[PDB]
Symmetry: C3
């Protein structure tokens, strides 16, 4: 029927892509197939700022300031727990696979800018932040507007109440229109998913062999553990069926895989949280856009594995604690950056630079980095998918502890 | 009375401009007169994005998706027909006038980027497209919002209906305010039109003599034919009186002439389509902003004539078919570019470059190009005016075939 | 209680700052204290465009076009009167203090661009002006929208009336939400004020000694006169108690002092004009944002004193008339620039350049300029505070002459 059509799009696309690439034809795919996926991506991007704004004004109106504060602190604690596990599994699986058994030849400290990152949460011109697509300051402004609106709707004067209600309905109507449009785009999603996975498989799939296959294997094993261990256990502890959860998350998960953007998947993730998970807008309109920018699980996994791979390729000895400190400094440097393709590759290059390594052409390290860079898309797909999964899990969890989860949705 | 005041502004301005230029005083005109016209232009530009957005959300709400699809395909077929005629008349009149009987001395292929032009129709951030004034993605977003809004207003739940109605009324109120403001600016239009035509006549009017006069004559003859043949015949075939049509179009036509921008005339063109032509908002809020960016009649005319002029000035033999292929490649390269001053001059320079010509200082071709460049404003006025005329004709025509034209407006 | 808490924040901050700087610790202040003030500044900046837009649409709706015209002309006449006095006091106090009795060693004319400044009042894309935070074109668009809205709400057709009312309520709700939020931020203001004055005192306070102290003394004396003479007399003549006025202005005045931005203080200035002064929105939503950008009192004072200081430091003879012409050309060059930190320092550098002086490293003039530059923050605080004071005075005055001032607010 319509349901699961996306999982067919993905599976069918990946096979076609592999075959096309193996036979030389990845160029034709780039020309003919890929535009359909680019279209899918654009259609979803179009929706990010309107749906995030309107949903959070409405959601933050629907809920008390207090409850919003608890949601903020609960979801941040969740992302700390889950990133700690992601660091663990990055270190473990990287070493189990022993990434980097090939042979090559074989000092920078910068101040912490988090004070300014926090200050930068506050927009100086909210129209500018909407036009530039900066999510976190829009979150801030939407929240304050929602709060203000509900304070005014309880005020005595009818003019203020009627004005506030009109404003809130304008945002409610926009949100509704966006959710409807998301549904329509998701009628198209299978074609887009096919086209995207096809292009990726044809270009970089053929390259996963030998050592790099163990890197890919290693990375994907880490994600797997993060899901079936960290997310499942957390869900069961709080009384959510993790298999039901996964079934409901599937459209968001596959979209995350192919689009390689947490923010670009947001309209889908939010529709899944509303229609499938049964989370109230007061929760997910806040937790989900926030988690799209602060979730550090995929980064911890990527850095743990690729840092080990690089160190071993150049024969540089790396202790588990030294790997841990390096991964942690990369994670701290990464916070606040939303999900974007080719991100972690850049961050890895930075991490290597900051520890005092020669990236000049011809160097061993430049070589190992280029090797990662060439499978980076394959790694990014997995990175984004595990992050969006963790976002849905944490949203659902927080919603449950707040009694904002509709239970009828969870029972066969 | 007030009506026809604009045609007096134009006529009076052009005479004053010619006289001032002939007597040396074009500098004083630039200083003292021109700012009033720049003001006219800015006041109209101010209105483009609000009126286009609100009118298309409302219009697309007022109408079924199906009807909107038919309007899309009908108006595109119209622009293909009319550009084919414009190519014809460009070739014909250019050769009849034998442009370029003066004597001078006397290889680049680039891939087609239309796939990406189409993809670029979809905005990735609609707030950004509003802030940057990109019309076609705003068209896309407005249409989808209108559709979504009407789907929601038929939904059962009263909260959704009331929210959707509030949102639609906000857009309706904005549109109404814009149309009212347009009316006010058009109280000022005669002064602006005077100032603009005055400046243009004083600076470049004095230069239309000898060979360049035949170029101007040639270009203006082509436009004339395009109107009295292509537009009139199309109007009569579908049962619109072309003389009544022209009478109603006059304010939009003159504004197009002086402002040299299809988009910058839009608030006027839309008010003319509503008040005078009697076209429903469901049609013109879509056809007119679209036609302002895809209409290729003025370009076909300009390229046909100026390409012939250049080829003859340098004594390069040019067959009718070779001229046709060149003009066609310029038109294909031009699609999607909205009406902007100094556009076609740039495109001509590109066309010359792409065929393998030396534009370096002192070269014959650099010389012929500079000669066109110096009358380019005079040519742009006509180019924009014929495009806006064709836009109104096609809007009216499409509206008639859809039974969206109010007939009481058409009968003395 | 809560009231006057800001004046404690200021006083306490300035003492802590001076002590910290005198003992070496200004670096720790920059690190630990200053971010709280930067936060204060950002929170206020966030509100400028929403509150200015919504208040002026509503205000301009509430009032007739005629009354708005009178408000425009009355407030401009006020700023001319008060800048003339500011020029006077700049010249007087500069010479009384005899700034520049230290000893050093010891031709550019550019056309007037005011025509284009005026043209630039009209936005070509109002969404762009909102996103870029350009106040004056937003003023223009809001006014025209307000006018249009009220014309439509008197129209016969109920659809137009209901649409216009919905649009106006959306703006009214937004304004209300902003004013509520301002109130909340002002709960935080004492901490921000403390942090800001602390940082400024620790960095540049210790440097006010010797000659530069006489410059600071001189500048602050001029501001003082401008207040207790120009503003007080104007207030008494029109029957406003100037001591009551000052008491009501205090929160806006202190915020202006520490933030060093007329525009950045606007949400506070407008809340003070509404809650304290009792000015109708029809007046202050227009006069206050306008006065924030056209008020030239602080500039006249700064230029008069610093120009004299520079001339005397290099032993260049400067007659009172020559000083006057110089200050006047700086004021004309400054009009239209809103209040921004480090502005006048730049303008002084320009003024020196335009009169034909050598600013190359090592030069006497480069030296005197650097000396001013090092206390410039201390001078900017005072400049901004006197401007915002004059803005409130003129708003109140204009409101009184229009019978838009609520008198119950003015009686103990
Ligand atoms: C960087 C910012 C990350 C956290 C932003 C939101 C945290 C929760 C706020 C709240 O409790 O309301
Ligand atoms: C990201 C979250 C941003 C900050 C939380 C929202 C604003 C805090 C003030 C709440 C107003 C109140 O106390 O009611
Ligand atoms: C499930 C969807 C399959 C696509 C995503 C899975 C991981 C990347 C593909 C696995 C590598 C393909 C084999 C490499 C090769 O053919 O040489
Ligand atoms: C790459 C993403 C792979 C699949 C996403 C969801 C997992 C499998 C499908 C539905 C879950 C279930 O079996 O119930
Ligand atoms: C480039 C784009 C030009 C055409 C855009 C609109 C075509 C008609 C769409 C429709 O049928 O709704
Ligand atoms: C330019 C025109 C843009 C595309 C046409 C509008 C969107 C197409 C989907 C229509 C929704 C539906 O089927 O009802
Ligand atoms: C009708 C309005 C007239 C202005 C537009 C018409 C075409 C451009 C002007 C015609 C050329 C003017 C004569 C040249 C000259 O004086 O030497
Ligand atoms: C340059 C534009 C010249 C005129 C525009 C319209 C044509 C003549 C005026 C009205 C038409 C009519 O005669 O009925
Ligand atoms: C530069 C612009 C400064 C003046 C802008 C507003 C002046 C008053 C307008 C009015 O009377 O409505
Ligand atoms: C800054 C002020 C901007 C201009 C004043 C407002 C617009 C002038 C036209 C008023 C409309 C009318 O006459 O009713
Ligand atoms: C009243 C608030 C005080 C702060 C603002 C007043 C003017 C600037 C400070 C005065 C100079 C401080 C003394 C200089 C020094 O300590 O050497
Ligand atoms: C620096 C700003 C200094 C103080 C601002 C207002 C003046 C004194 C406080 C209230 C006025 C009063 O005494 O009634």
């Amino acid at each position: 029927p319509v349901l699961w059509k996306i999982l067919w799009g993905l599976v069918l696309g990946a096979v076609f892509g592999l075959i096309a690439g193996h036979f030389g034809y990845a160029g034709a795919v780039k020309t003919y197939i890929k535009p359909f996926g680019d279209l899918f991506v654009r259609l979803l991007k179009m929706l990010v700022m309107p749906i995030v704004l309107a949903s959070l004004v409405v959601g933050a109106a629907s809920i008390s300031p207090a409850r919003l504060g608890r949601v903020g602190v609960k979801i941040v604690v969740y992302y700390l727990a889950t990133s700690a596990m992601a660091v663990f599994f990055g270190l473990i699986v990287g070493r189990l696979f022993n990434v980097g058994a090939n042979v090559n030849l074989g000092i920078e400290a910068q101040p912490p800018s988090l004070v300014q990152t926090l200050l930068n949460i506050v927009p100086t011109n909210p129209f500018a932040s909407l036009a530039k697509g900066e999510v976190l300051p829009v979150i801030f402004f939407a929240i304050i507007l929602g709060i203000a609106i509900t304070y005014l709707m309880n005020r005595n004067e009818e003019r203020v109440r009627k004005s506030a209600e009109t404003l809130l309905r304008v945002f409610d109507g926009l949100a509704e229109a966006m959710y409807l449009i998301v549904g329509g785009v998701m009628q198209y999603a299978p074609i887009g998913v096919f086209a995207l996975i096809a292009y990726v498989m044809a270009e970089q799939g053929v390259r996963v062999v030998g050592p790099l296959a163990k890197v890919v294997g290693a990375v994907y094993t880490g994600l797997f553990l993060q899901i079936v261990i960290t997310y499942f256990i957390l869900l069961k502890v709080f009384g959510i069926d993790p298999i039901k959860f996964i079934r409901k998350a599937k459209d968001a998960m596959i979209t995350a895989f192919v689009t390689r953007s947490s923010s670009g998947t947001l309209p889908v993730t939010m529709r899944v949280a509303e229609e499938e998970m049964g989370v109230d807008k007061g929760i997910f309109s806040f937790t989900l856009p926030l988690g799209a920018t602060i979730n550090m699980d995929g980064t911890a996994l990527y850095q743990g594995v690729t840092v080990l791979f690089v160190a071993n390729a150049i024969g540089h000895p790396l202790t588990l604690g030294q790997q841990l400190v390096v991964v942690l400094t990369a994670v701290l440097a990464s916070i606040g950056t939303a999900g974007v393709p080719g991100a972690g590759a850049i961050m890895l290059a930075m991490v290597l630079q900051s520890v005092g390594l020669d990236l000049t052409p011809g160097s061993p390290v430049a070589l190992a980095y280029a090797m990662i860079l060439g499978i980076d898309a394959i790694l990014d797909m997995g990175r984004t998918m595990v992050n969006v999964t963790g976002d849905l899990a944490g949203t659902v969890i927080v919603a449950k502890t707040e009694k904002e989860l509709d239970e009828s949705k969870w029972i066969s």
